[PDB]
Amino acid sequence: TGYTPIDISLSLTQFLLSEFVPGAGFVLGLVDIIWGIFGPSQWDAFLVQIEQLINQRIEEFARNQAISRLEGLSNLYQIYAESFREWEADPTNPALREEMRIQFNDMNSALTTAIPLFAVQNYQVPLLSVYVQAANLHLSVLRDVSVFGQRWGFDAATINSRYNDLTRLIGNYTDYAVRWYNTGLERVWGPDSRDWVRYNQFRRELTLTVLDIVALFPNYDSRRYPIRTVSQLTREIYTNPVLENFDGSFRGSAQGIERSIRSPHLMDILNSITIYTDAHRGYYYWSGHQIMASPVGFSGPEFTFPLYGTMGNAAPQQRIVAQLGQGVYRTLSSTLYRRPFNIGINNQQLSVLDGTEFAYGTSSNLPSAVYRKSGTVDSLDEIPPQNNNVPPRQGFSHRLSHVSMFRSGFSNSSVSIIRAPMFSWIHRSAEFNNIIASDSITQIPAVKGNFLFNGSVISGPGFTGGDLVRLNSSGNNIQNRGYIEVPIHFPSTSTRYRVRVRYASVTPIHLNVNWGNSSIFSNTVPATATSLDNLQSSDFGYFESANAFTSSLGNIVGVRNFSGTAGVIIDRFEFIPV
């Protein structure tokens, strides 16, 4: 196959993003993508994928115990799934209802017992992806009993008790996973470029196999999400062909490489990249470039970033239009390393790109844009498809959101030149527009807004699928009130929507939600957190408009912080069709 846990996880994410609704389909999805396997192979592969990265194998007894238990859970969940399917086909049947009650208890009990074995002391990191798979299944099964347990014949006390388990464990599993993600990532940090490559690889691979799945855990709260709900993952992950295809190591460069990534920002759409070519001893290369981007929904003028790298004129500038079709899904780069025996200003070490093909996502086909030539350092190896049953240009998992640059040296005066374009990839669930569905709960992260006043975009804690918006206090000035505004599009003009906001606050705070020019909520909302600096799962709460409205109110939604002294974090807006 050539498949890894990264491929499998991306496919699970596609499923959880588009089919997050209770019923037989969800249960059978999980068997099809993850739990329907035979034997230890898949599980062993999940462990190897992290073990080989941190260069540490799990102690052999604990390793075999974890694998062995996952096999048991798989067998048991296959039986549960089949019983569920049979029950759904004939729901009033008391034999099938009794079998669901027994199967749920066995599944619930088995998972509660198994999970600590995926959290074994000194091996939490390499066990983290199987931990998260088991957690996911557990929350799934607790959600099942919450939605269907009455129909199965459980009493109200048992149902409410299992529901309280669900909401608590959404929190505990999330905090555990993020904690060990942070700890694992930090242990892999080092001062040189080889360390940075490993560090970013850890970030990338565990974003795909852990954090992306953890960001969907809140969706399991059936009282909060009683119908289908669609999340959007706005976080960016990174490739860097020059650094990642380099067998040596630039000393002390790790910090500089990490800082070449741009800081937290409102989501934008990459429109074009204009690449400048420089040359040395007949070797032509990508010396610098300029990015042009738009706000979400193309809802404001195109803006230009400051020049990346240096503006060479060894050949004419080339404008690559990124935003054709579904955008650029893939880069195929040619790396150029020059390492002469005798180096100097007239005979430089070069670490650069002498070519890149930019390939487009498209439901048919579009010729690639090519800077000079194609190459074989392929983003698809690190940023694989979410659906490998169609061609990659249709089954892609990410879109190119930005290109920045790690750079060192000047062509006129340095012995060593590094120009290492940093490619930034956003998950394709981050839609170009904010489109409100009529038959599901649409989640729109606040970082998908296009106007932020007296506030800033801050790094997410790792479990929200992206970054967050912080609205500052006014300093008791009514004209200086923190505001985030989000452009939205309603394909259905008759559906009525309640607007719910997910937020974090240390003190009770007065917030105003506008839909168009109309205020649909203006009240104090409770404190949810002890600190805005170290967010855990339970620090996020919800408030909502009491009434429901239609798109006649307008094409923007916003939140304003009325407090003169306190700040607030906005995660996302949620539209609930009534």
From Swiss-Prot:
Listed GO MF terms: signaling receptor binding; toxin activity
Q: Which UniProt keywords apply?
A: Genetically modified food, Plasmid, Sporulation, Toxin, Virulence
Q: How is it used?
A: Introduced by genetic manipulation and expressed in insect-resistant cotton and tomato by Calgene (Monsanto) and in maize by Dekalb Genetics.
Q: Which GO terms describe its biological process?
A: sporulation resulting in formation of a cellular spore; symbiont-mediated killing of host cell
Q: What does this protein do?
A: Promotes colloidosmotic lysis by binding to the midgut epithelial cells of many lepidopteran larvae.
Q: What else is known?
A: Toxic segment of the protein is located in the N-terminus.
**Similarity section:** Belongs to the delta endotoxin family.
Q: Under what name is this protein listed?
A: Pesticidal crystal protein Cry1Ac
Q: Which organism is it from?
A: Bacillus thuringiensis subsp. kurstaki
Q: Which residues of the full protein are shown?
A: 31 to 608 of 1178
